[PDB]
Amino acid sequence: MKVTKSEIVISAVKPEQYPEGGLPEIALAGRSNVGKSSFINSLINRQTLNFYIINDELHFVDVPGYGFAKVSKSEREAWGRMIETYITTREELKAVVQIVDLRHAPSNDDVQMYEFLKYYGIPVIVIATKADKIPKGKWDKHAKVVRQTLNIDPEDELILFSSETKKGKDEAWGAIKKMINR
Numbered sequence: 142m143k144v145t146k147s148e149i150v151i152s153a154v155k156p157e158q159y160p161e162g163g164l165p166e167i168a169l170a171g172r173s174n175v176g177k178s179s180f181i182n183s184l185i186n187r188q189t190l191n192f193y194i195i196n197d198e199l200h201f202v203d204v205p206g207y208g209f210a211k212v213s214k215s216e217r218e219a220w221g222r223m224i225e226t227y228i229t230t231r232e233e234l235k236a237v238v239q240i241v242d243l244r245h246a247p248s249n250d251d252v253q254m255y256e257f258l259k260y261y262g263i264p265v266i267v268i269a270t271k272a273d274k275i276p277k278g279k280w281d282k283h284a285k286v287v288r289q290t291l292n293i294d295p296e297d298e299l300i301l302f303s304s305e306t307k308k309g310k311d312e313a314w315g316a317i318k319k320m321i322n323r
């Protein structure tokens with residue numbers, strides 16, 4: 142997608158705050174510091190659920206990074222409610238881009254998130270980023286580990302990505318498009 146417009150529209154602490162209009166939504170989730178914000182900025186050339194209007198045709202919905210253990214119990218609880226509410230009630234949601242680090246096996250938190258999404262029948266685009274930190278010759282090895290750890294559904298997608306080199310950008314947009322026009 143040639144992005145000519147992208148800007149935050151709301152930072153929702155509650156579902157009442159979600160934007161109206163009914164445009165398709167693609168939510169993004171991953172471990173804190175995995176490279177989610179870098180992934181977003183790459184695609185568009187640049188305690189709340191943040192909605193970004195893209196080209197006035199869809200919203201990216203950025204979910205606060207998970208797996209950061211130095212968080213209060215109340216914050217973790219709030220995070221859980223927020224995502225559970227969103228995932229289970231949002232009709233506009235077409236897919237979640239789950240971003241993981243290609244360098245290592247996905248974590249227990251990644252697996253939990255993936256299992257949660259599949260439980261609710263949510264289409265997922267798995268992005269394994271930081272690919273540039275691994276020799277090209279090992280990309281397949283590391284991708285196989287990601288695939289087997291999450292046990293990725295064959296209808297989901299696994300795309301290797303790098304915010305450094307923009308590897309995966311076109312493929313990621315292409316997948317978002319398939320998900321939106323399902």
Ligand SMILES: Nc1nc2c(ncn2[C@@H]2O[C@H](COP(=O)(O)OP(=O)(O)O)[C@@H](O)[C@H]2O)c(=O)[nH]1
Pocket residue numbers: 171172173174175176177178179180206270271272273274302303304305306
């Ligand atoms: N080498 C490399 N570094 C990356 C990549 N993506 C993110 N980073 C770096 O990893 C750190 C965390 O990335 P960031 O997008 O801020 O993480 P976020 O917390 O998930 O939003 C930053 O220092 C980024 O520069 C990538 O694909 N390749």
